[PDB]
Amino acid sequence: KLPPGPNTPYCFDQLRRRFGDVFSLQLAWTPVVVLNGLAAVREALVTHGEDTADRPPVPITQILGFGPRSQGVFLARYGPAWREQRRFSVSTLRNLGLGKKSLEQWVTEEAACLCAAFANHSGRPFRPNGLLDKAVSNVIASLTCGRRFEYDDPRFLRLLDLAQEGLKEESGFLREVLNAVPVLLHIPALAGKVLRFQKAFLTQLDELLTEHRMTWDPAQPPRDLTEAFLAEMEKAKGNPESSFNDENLRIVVADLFSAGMETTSTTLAWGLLLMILHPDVQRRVQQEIDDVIGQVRRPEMGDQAHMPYTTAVIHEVQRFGDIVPLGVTHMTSRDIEVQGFRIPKGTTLITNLSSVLKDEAVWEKPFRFHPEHFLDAQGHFVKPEAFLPFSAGRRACLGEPLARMELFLFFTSLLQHFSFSVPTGQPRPSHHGVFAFLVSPSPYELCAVPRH
Numbered sequence: 442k443l444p445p446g447p448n449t450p451y452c453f454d455q456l457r458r459r460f461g462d463v464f465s466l467q468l469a470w471t472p473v474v475v476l477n478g479l480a481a482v483r484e485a486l487v488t489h490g491e492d493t494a495d496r497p498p499v500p501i502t503q504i505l506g507f508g509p510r511s512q513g514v515f516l517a518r519y520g521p522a523w524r525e526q527r528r529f530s531v532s533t534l535r536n537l538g539l540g541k542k543s544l545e546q547w548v549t550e551e552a553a554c555l556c557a558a559f560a561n562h563s564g565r566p567f568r569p570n571g572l573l574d575k576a577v578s579n580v581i582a583s584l585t586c587g588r589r590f591e592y593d594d595p596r597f598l599r600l601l602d603l604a605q606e607g608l609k610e611e612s613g614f615l616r617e618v619l620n621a622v623p624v625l626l627h628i629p630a631l632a633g634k635v636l637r638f639q640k641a642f643l644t645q646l647d648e649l650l651t652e653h654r655m656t657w658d659p660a661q662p663p664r665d666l667t668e669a670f671l672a673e674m675e676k677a678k679g680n681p682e683s684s685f686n687d688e689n690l691r692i693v694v695a696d697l698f699s700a701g702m703e704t705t706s707t708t709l710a711w712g713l714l715l716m717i718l719h720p721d722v723q724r725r726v727q728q729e730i731d732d733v734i735g736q737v738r739r740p741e742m743g744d745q746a747h748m749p750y751t752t753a754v755i756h757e758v759q760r761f762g763d764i765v766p767l768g769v770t771h772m773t774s775r776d777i778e779v780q781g782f783r784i785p786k787g788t789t790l791i792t793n794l795s796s797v798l799k800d801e802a803v804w805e806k807p808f809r810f811h812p813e814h815f816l817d818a819q820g821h822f823v824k825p826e827a828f829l830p831f832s833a834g835r836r837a838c839l840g841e842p843l844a845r846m847e848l849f850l851f852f853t854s855l856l857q858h859f860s861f862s863v864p865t866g867q868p869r870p871s872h873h874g875v876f877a878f879l880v881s882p883s884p885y886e887l888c889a890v891p892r893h
């Protein structure tokens with residue numbers, strides 16, 4: 442028995458209440474099943490984990506150097522190419538985060554830089570989005586190339602702008618056209634234009650990787666992910682089965698920027714917004730900051746386990762902000778069943794994470810901003826199983842530990858040194874997002890006033 446069935450996230454909400462948690466659609470020329478609520482998402486991605494970890498093919502990635510051992514991680518098919526890069530990135534992130542604690546130090550320094558760029562606005566109103574973008578990009582640059590960029594660096598601005606444009610290309614009529622029917626990529630006028638900006642983004646990274654190649658000291662342990670990768674590539678010369686090759690290096694690095702920039706930055710943008718709309722919550726986080734850390738010392742990760750309210754608030758920013766509502770598509774390898782219905786092999790799965798984060802049977806007030814969603818009456822932090830902003834299963838976000846570190850360190854450092862407020866004489870910003878692959882706060886401005 443197949444599932445029933447006839448911007449986007451609201452239409453899927455209505456379709457849920459019509460046909461239920463597991464329903465069918467036939468978009469482009471593609472069979473889709475949408476999954477709603479914890480139980481269907483969990484059943485598909487965990488219980489049937491082994492047969493839902495594949496990605497729908499994407500013909501136009503042909504343009505970006507994709508091949509059987511050059512698929513990067515994000516859109517790579519389930520198989521050894523995916524699995525080798527997934528293990529590499531996971532363990533590289535673990536290693537860089539242990540011993541010397543390099544990632545934590547890079548994030549701590551970027552938070553200091555980010556506070557200074559906030560101070561220099563001197564209590565005049567401003568949109569914080571651009572600065573959040575830069576801070577979070579520098580964390581990726583640190584992870585992947587072992588450097589940061591000055592916030593006024595022109596190359597950095599260029600890399601950022603190209604990245605923003607190349608996210609737009611991910612959601613295009615054009616893009617879906619050649620993707621859905623790929624034989625029109627023989628026409629050079631079409632092919633050259635779909636991923637114009639992504640190619641330029643990739644060209645700018647190539648330039649950075651070339652520089653990094655020159656300064657790499659292979660006589661020392663790798664100090665960042667690209668070095669670790671380059672070391673593996675050397676061991677793999679003469680092995681055509683390896684995914685450690687120059688064509689894949691640039692896709693892996695570009696996947697890490699693509700997946701880890703706008704998500705983390707947009708989440709922080711939600712957090713500041715929710716802090717000026719809910720100044721009472723802001724002050725109570727500032728209370729816990731002062732009482733656990735002080736107004737002087739830089740926040741460290743070891744603080745987080747003693748700050749259940751700030752942890753609650755950050756979790757609630759993620760749940761309410763709901764920045765990846767329809768997740769990232771999967772594809773079924775074998776046939777499976779979910780909530781009774783049968784799902785044939787080759788079906789594109791859409792995981793409706795928003796329906797998990799906003800399930801009315803799980804959360805007390807799913808459409809309000811409410812830190813007590815993660816607090817018990819004693820004030821202990823609790824994390825409900827429906828907290829899945831990173832999805833679940835084999836393909837669940839590999840950057841989650843770095844994002845948790847970034848959200849806590851950037852968010853607490855900022856509220857440690859500033860008070861945020863709607864600027865006098867402007868409308869209360871809306872708390873409704875704008876969907877465009879990611880859900881972002883409506884554009885808003887704020888005042889950052891130092892606290893000492």
Ligand code: HEM
Nearest residue numbers: 515700701704705708765769831832836837838839840844
């Ligand atoms: C709040 C911040 C973030 C959120 C909400 C987020 C969310 C997600 C989601 C929903 C997925 C889809 C998982 C699926 O296929 O079901 C994903 C995958 C992924 N994310 Fe994140 N992400 C965040 C930050 C990051 C960071 C900082 C990095 C890199 C350092 C990163 C790298 C990746 C990669 C490489 C994948 C694909 C994993 C795979 O296909 O094996 N993300 N993320």
Ligand SMILES: CSc1ccc2c(c1)N(CC[C@H]1CCCCN1C)c1ccccc1S2
Nearest residue numbers: 505515516604607608639692695696699700
């Ligand atoms: C600024 S280019 C950009 C920005 C944000 C995202 C993505 C691309 N990608 C694909 C990553 C791509 C990067 C170029 C090399 C090949 N790989 C696969 C993506 C795909 C599907 C859902 C979400 C996302 S997040």
Ligand SMILES: CSc1ccc2c(c1)N(CC[C@H]1CCCCN1C)c1ccccc1S2
Nearest residue numbers: 449468469471473612617767768769770789
């Ligand atoms: C890749 S990660 C990701 C995460 C959420 C969505 C999408 C992709 N897609 C692809 C759905 C796809 C199914 C097969 C036929 C063509 N259609 C678009 C999408 C694209 C544009 C608007 C909304 C959405 S929902």
Ligand SMILES: [Zn+2]
Nearest residue numbers: 586587665668
């Ligand atoms: Zn390096």
Ligand SMILES: [Zn+2]
Nearest residue numbers: 817819820821
């Ligand atoms: Zn308790």
Ligand SMILES: [Zn+2]
Nearest residue numbers: 857858891893
């Ligand atoms: Zn200060």
